[PDB]
Amino acid sequence: MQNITQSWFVQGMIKATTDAWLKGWDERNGGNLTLRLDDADIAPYHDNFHQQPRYIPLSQPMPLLANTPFIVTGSGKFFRNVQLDPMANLGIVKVDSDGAGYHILWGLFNEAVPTSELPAHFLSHCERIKATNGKDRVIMHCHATNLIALTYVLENDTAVFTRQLWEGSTECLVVFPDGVGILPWMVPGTDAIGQATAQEMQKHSLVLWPFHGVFGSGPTLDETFGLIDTAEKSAQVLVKVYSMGGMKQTISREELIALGKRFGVTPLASALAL
Amino acid sequence: MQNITQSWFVQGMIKATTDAWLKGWDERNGGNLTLRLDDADIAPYHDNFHQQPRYIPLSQPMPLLANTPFIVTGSGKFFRNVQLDPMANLGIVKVDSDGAGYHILWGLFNEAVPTSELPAHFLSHCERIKATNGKDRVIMHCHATNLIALTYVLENDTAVFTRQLWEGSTECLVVFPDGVGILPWMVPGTDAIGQATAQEMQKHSLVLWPFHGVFGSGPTLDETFGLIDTAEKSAQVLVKVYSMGGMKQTISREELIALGKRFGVTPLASALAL
Amino acid sequence: MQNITQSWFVQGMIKATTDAWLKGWDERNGGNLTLRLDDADIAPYHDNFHQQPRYIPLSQPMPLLANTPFIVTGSGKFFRNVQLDPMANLGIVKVDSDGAGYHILWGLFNEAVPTSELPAHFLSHCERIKATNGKDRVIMHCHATNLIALTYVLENDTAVFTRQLWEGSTECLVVFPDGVGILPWMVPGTDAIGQATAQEMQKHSLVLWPFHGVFGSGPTLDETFGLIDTAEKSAQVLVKVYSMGGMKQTISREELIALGKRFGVTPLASALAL
Amino acid sequence: MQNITQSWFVQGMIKATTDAWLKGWDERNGGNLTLRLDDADIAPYHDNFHQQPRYIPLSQPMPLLANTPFIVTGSGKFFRNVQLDPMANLGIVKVDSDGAGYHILWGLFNEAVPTSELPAHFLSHCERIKATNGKDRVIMHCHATNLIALTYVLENDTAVFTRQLWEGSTECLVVFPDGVGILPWMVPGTDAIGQATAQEMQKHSLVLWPFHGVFGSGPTLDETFGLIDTAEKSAQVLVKVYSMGGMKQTISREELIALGKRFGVTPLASALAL
Ligand SMILES: [Ca+2]
Ligand SMILES: [Ca+2]
Ligand SMILES: [Ca+2]
Ligand SMILES: [Ca+2]
Ligand SMILES: [Zn+2]
Ligand SMILES: [Zn+2]
Ligand SMILES: [Zn+2]
Ligand SMILES: [Zn+2]
Ligand SMILES: [Zn+2]
Ligand SMILES: [Zn+2]
Ligand SMILES: [Zn+2]
Ligand SMILES: [Zn+2]
């Protein structure tokens, strides 16, 4: 075809990672981004693939993802660098017929260790597929600065934290009416945190990791980035308000109820009851 | 002609939306921008228009806008993306001979729903035309971060809020001597908030929506952006000052009076009396 | 020659104004920048000049500036736009043989009112020429955000304010050992504020206008920008420290004395005595 | 060859300095960056070198660096300008056979004074070579804003300061398990501060200079920048948290212990014991 680096999905991965870098959310190798593709996306470019795509087994088979391709940021790669060398910093993988492993079709020098966070991402993709009847395609982790700061000062409780974010920008209830699930602090990279995050993804499109960052899902790169950006903007507003001594006034429960009815969403009951 | 994407007004819309994106004012699809044009602006490009421009009725006819073209950001579009694909994210519309509806001449894939916020914008354009004897041409809504934060901590009163913004940068009284009208919180997208905003636009070039954002008017894209940027800069200064424990000294009433006389403006009486 | 827009000084004016825009210091038409040139800079380009350069008298003759060319930002122009259209937003002027007026050689559509702030700038250039035996060539005014915020919370006194800025970054005493002169608030654009600023320029390379901004001088665009940037960086640090409850420790008088001796500067006595 | 300005190491120096400029860490001539090269890096370009490379003696011979080339930012140069004119703002130097001096092979107009900070950098390179069995190649000094602010409000003690940075982003213990060494304030540019910094570099990859900035080491430009960026991001989070009234909850000692075991690092004992 044209080269795969000019494909919609490589260009989209470059845009999202670069935008997140520019926001200050992705120091060093902090953050990861995975996008579920279709065969029709990657098929024109198959002669650009690795001659012998490396195979990586999954310890935990995921048959819901059989035969499914993804484009991913590599483990240890810097979001800042994706724009400079997408083939070095991104990979295209395809899960096998059994969901027992994946082949690295393109990128990452055909190496296994830059795909280390994929089994955790894959667990969350699976729960988002089920929760959204296949609409969601993206899992994005970043170190969203104000959301992180808030985890040191707000109660790390889904209802309470959700409610404050809803109050901090009018749009938030409409963008994430299901709220933001808040886990306990957990050691990153473990089976435990991957399972716990996927469990929260059953009920929320946003999950926070206290003293660490955020994990979001959505149907497209832009919608997923925009979801995170909306929560982080509210957080930014809140950090300013709290630094000024706290809220003198805010959006009321009654107003939040009226907002949800107008926009035809069901706000998370526990956060709305506060 | 040359292509319409290189026209002064498409390029100007790209600049304004991109600049607002870069300021952090327009997460996701937050914000909207409409610019009133003349027939002479768009006429050279008419063979670039949609073959059969889609017609959208206005529930509320606006004869003051008969035969008037505009360029607009689409409903649901991201300011960040305007620079990447102006034809997808912007539309050119023209109100009909009766003010009873508009045709989508260009952009937006000739679709109706990305023009959903136009009847509210149009109500404010009408009041600004009358208030400025036709000089004002732009309505801009964005989520200006520090202005939003201030609505949680200052009294949401036109006089009081105006006065603080005037104190937070010397230029402000000269740039917006008529002040900043502050509405109650209202559900967005409703006839109620569109009418209420237009009512405030009779008396002010800036209107704030508590816990949401700002709505500004002016004669050009740059002047309208600059108006908002001036208020938001003052707000940024104020958030820092309030975070440091508040004002030790400030611009006095007497100084604000002297400033207005030198620059030949009439400052809003209620804000000046404080 | 090559076109004058590619000249070192037009390119330098673009860089400085653009960098200041990007810092957030120059909303709207806030700020102004003037650079003293030599005839040898502009001579190659004389056939690019206005056919009949417009003449503007100076109410206050300045014979020290006889025959001297400058490149300037226009009155009412936006720093953001200089990069897009330097000829519209910048002018080259040359003071006449008597210092009684200046000709607009290039730019600004050969119009007088975008040169309105020049008589004030010229007064400060004159005092900086005398104070530096002709080394200083630049006067820069901008709305440096943290410096502005500090004028609401620190005593607006040269010694006190200088001392805090020296404490807020180790470099500051070495970069501006003569300190920062602080005026009372004054109505901008007046003969009074222009004279008062020039009077302070006799003793300091930096002057602050409370609740407004900063005015700096130096030998080159980069050194002048860097001077302002150094003070503003210290201010940024200070705003954070004050927002966190104030200094637990700081640079001592004894340390500031040792710093000045090592770097061979004489720190402003009043600020050092505190 | 191709020109040396397109070499990996000139391009890398441009990227790192530009990125640091954009972060706000390197006002004026604040900051310095040195990268240890191999002969094979520079050899293709030798006919681009100065005809007669200037020789600069070292007062303190450093035989560990005999025959070793480096690329460096010049003394007095602005990080902002490196991208505009790398040959003016960068130099390539090579230490002689005895470690008694260095030749300026390229850049800096073959002048001595823009290499003034090299003997201090070289002392730290020597200790990092020994501490890392030759893996570390980069010394970077910058004025990282939030780290600087924190030195006015936290105890300037290695253990205490390290512990807070570890708490302010989960990654930090894994990225700098050896902690951040904190010196007393010292007059910059002196033999004393260069020796003291090198002494701290024996035990830490990061050193802070209170009321001034940070000094980091690592194997590549990206890893060194990323190290600093990680500490500075944590600092940014902390400044927000402290401005909001302090931590309500944080990462516990027990959690930090579990984190270090999972990632196979030995956290600095004193910081972990708190
Ligand atoms: Ca939950
Ligand atoms: Ca009003
Ligand atoms: Ca003085
Ligand atoms: Ca130590
Ligand atoms: Zn992470
Ligand atoms: Zn709960
Ligand atoms: Zn809005
Ligand atoms: Zn009122
Ligand atoms: Zn000004
Ligand atoms: Zn005094
Ligand atoms: Zn330094
Ligand atoms: Zn200790």
PDB file of C-alpha atoms in Angstrom, chain A residues 36-123:
ATOM      1  CA  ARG A  36      -8.321  -2.831  19.064  1.00  0.00           C
ATOM      2  CA  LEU A  37      -8.310  -2.993  15.251  1.00  0.00           C
ATOM      3  CA  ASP A  38     -10.070  -5.048  12.595  1.00  0.00           C
ATOM      4  CA  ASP A  39      -8.357  -7.264  10.035  1.00  0.00           C
ATOM      5  CA  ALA A  40      -9.462  -4.839   7.298  1.00  0.00           C
ATOM      6  CA  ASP A  41      -7.366  -2.088   8.943  1.00  0.00           C
ATOM      7  CA  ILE A  42      -4.091  -3.991   8.782  1.00  0.00           C
ATOM      8  CA  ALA A  43      -4.587  -6.302   5.757  1.00  0.00           C
ATOM      9  CA  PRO A  44      -3.322  -3.911   3.042  1.00  0.00           C
ATOM     10  CA  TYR A  45      -0.004  -3.654   4.844  1.00  0.00           C
ATOM     11  CA  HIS A  46       0.738  -7.333   5.461  1.00  0.00           C
ATOM     12  CA  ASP A  47       3.912  -7.369   3.347  1.00  0.00           C
ATOM     13  CA  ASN A  48       5.331  -4.747   5.750  1.00  0.00           C
ATOM     14  CA  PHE A  49       5.040  -7.202   8.617  1.00  0.00           C
ATOM     15  CA  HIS A  50       7.883  -9.034  10.293  1.00  0.00           C
ATOM     16  CA  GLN A  51       8.900 -12.051   8.223  1.00  0.00           C
ATOM     17  CA  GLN A  52       8.362 -14.361  11.170  1.00  0.00           C
ATOM     18  CA  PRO A  53       6.169 -12.572  13.727  1.00  0.00           C
ATOM     19  CA  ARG A  54       7.279 -13.470  17.220  1.00  0.00           C
ATOM     20  CA  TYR A  55       4.783 -15.552  19.247  1.00  0.00           C
ATOM     21  CA  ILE A  56       4.088 -14.726  22.894  1.00  0.00           C
ATOM     22  CA  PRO A  57       1.872 -17.104  24.937  1.00  0.00           C
ATOM     23  CA  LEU A  58      -0.720 -15.786  27.315  1.00  0.00           C
ATOM     24  CA  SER A  59      -0.661 -17.416  30.679  1.00  0.00           C
ATOM     25  CA  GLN A  60      -4.342 -16.676  30.927  1.00  0.00           C
ATOM     26  CA  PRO A  61      -6.107 -17.508  27.656  1.00  0.00           C
ATOM     27  CA  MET A  62      -8.596 -15.022  26.365  1.00  0.00           C
ATOM     28  CA  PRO A  63     -10.848 -16.598  23.778  1.00  0.00           C
ATOM     29  CA  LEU A  64     -13.028 -13.467  23.507  1.00  0.00           C
ATOM     30  CA  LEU A  65      -9.997 -11.891  21.800  1.00  0.00           C
ATOM     31  CA  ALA A  66      -9.269 -14.747  19.363  1.00  0.00           C
ATOM     32  CA  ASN A  67      -7.999 -13.557  16.010  1.00  0.00           C
ATOM     33  CA  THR A  68      -8.077  -9.906  17.119  1.00  0.00           C
ATOM     34  CA  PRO A  69      -5.420  -7.383  16.083  1.00  0.00           C
ATOM     35  CA  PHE A  70      -4.297  -4.416  18.191  1.00  0.00           C
ATOM     36  CA  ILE A  71      -1.835  -1.543  17.917  1.00  0.00           C
ATOM     37  CA  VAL A  72      -0.003  -0.858  21.184  1.00  0.00           C
ATOM     38  CA  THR A  73       2.686   1.302  22.748  1.00  0.00           C
ATOM     39  CA  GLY A  74       5.743  -0.711  23.742  1.00  0.00           C
ATOM     40  CA  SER A  75       6.693  -1.514  27.361  1.00  0.00           C
ATOM     41  CA  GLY A  76       9.450   0.862  28.375  1.00  0.00           C
ATOM     42  CA  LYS A  77       8.884   3.226  25.449  1.00  0.00           C
ATOM     43  CA  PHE A  78       8.409   6.946  25.889  1.00  0.00           C
ATOM     44  CA  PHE A  79       5.203   8.582  24.649  1.00  0.00           C
ATOM     45  CA  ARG A  80       7.361  11.570  23.642  1.00  0.00           C
ATOM     46  CA  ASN A  81       9.235   9.429  21.108  1.00  0.00           C
ATOM     47  CA  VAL A  82       6.274   7.816  19.300  1.00  0.00           C
ATOM     48  CA  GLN A  83       6.141  10.704  16.805  1.00  0.00           C
ATOM     49  CA  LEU A  84       9.857  10.413  16.072  1.00  0.00           C
ATOM     50  CA  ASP A  85       9.922   6.654  15.363  1.00  0.00           C
ATOM     51  CA  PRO A  86       6.534   4.953  15.408  1.00  0.00           C
ATOM     52  CA  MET A  87       7.891   1.587  14.256  1.00  0.00           C
ATOM     53  CA  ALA A  88      10.350   1.452  17.190  1.00  0.00           C
ATOM     54  CA  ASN A  89       7.840   2.561  19.833  1.00  0.00           C
ATOM     55  CA  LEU A  90       4.595   0.918  18.663  1.00  0.00           C
ATOM     56  CA  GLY A  91       3.681  -2.654  17.831  1.00  0.00           C
ATOM     57  CA  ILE A  92       0.852  -4.342  15.952  1.00  0.00           C
ATOM     58  CA  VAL A  93      -0.078  -7.692  17.537  1.00  0.00           C
ATOM     59  CA  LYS A  94      -2.714 -10.270  16.697  1.00  0.00           C
ATOM     60  CA  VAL A  95      -4.181 -12.758  19.196  1.00  0.00           C
ATOM     61  CA  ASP A  96      -4.276 -16.326  17.925  1.00  0.00           C
ATOM     62  CA  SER A  97      -7.204 -18.585  17.105  1.00  0.00           C
ATOM     63  CA  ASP A  98      -7.402 -19.876  20.669  1.00  0.00           C
ATOM     64  CA  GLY A  99      -6.682 -16.748  22.541  1.00  0.00           C
ATOM     65  CA  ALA A 100      -3.667 -18.533  23.933  1.00  0.00           C
ATOM     66  CA  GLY A 101      -1.093 -16.013  22.696  1.00  0.00           C
ATOM     67  CA  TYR A 102      -0.328 -13.304  20.223  1.00  0.00           C
ATOM     68  CA  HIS A 103       1.971 -12.720  17.262  1.00  0.00           C
ATOM     69  CA  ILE A 104       3.934  -9.461  16.937  1.00  0.00           C
ATOM     70  CA  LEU A 105       3.160  -8.539  13.338  1.00  0.00           C
ATOM     71  CA  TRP A 106       4.935  -5.174  13.140  1.00  0.00           C
ATOM     72  CA  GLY A 107       7.080  -2.839  15.183  1.00  0.00           C
ATOM     73  CA  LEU A 108       8.912  -3.118  18.478  1.00  0.00           C
ATOM     74  CA  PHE A 109      11.834  -4.893  16.713  1.00  0.00           C
ATOM     75  CA  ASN A 110       9.647  -8.049  17.048  1.00  0.00           C
ATOM     76  CA  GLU A 111      10.488  -8.255  20.789  1.00  0.00           C
ATOM     77  CA  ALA A 112       8.404  -9.719  23.621  1.00  0.00           C
ATOM     78  CA  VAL A 113       9.196  -7.549  26.616  1.00  0.00           C
ATOM     79  CA  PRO A 114       7.738  -4.291  25.149  1.00  0.00           C
ATOM     80  CA  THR A 115       4.417  -6.229  25.156  1.00  0.00           C
ATOM     81  CA  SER A 116       4.523  -7.024  28.918  1.00  0.00           C
ATOM     82  CA  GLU A 117       1.449  -4.898  29.926  1.00  0.00           C
ATOM     83  CA  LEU A 118      -0.756  -6.427  27.259  1.00  0.00           C
ATOM     84  CA  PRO A 119      -2.252  -9.244  29.280  1.00  0.00           C
ATOM     85  CA  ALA A 120      -3.541  -6.613  31.801  1.00  0.00           C
ATOM     86  CA  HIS A 121      -4.884  -4.404  29.009  1.00  0.00           C
ATOM     87  CA  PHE A 122      -6.484  -7.365  27.357  1.00  0.00           C
ATOM     88  CA  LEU A 123      -8.381  -8.236  30.558  1.00  0.00           C
TER      89      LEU A 123
END
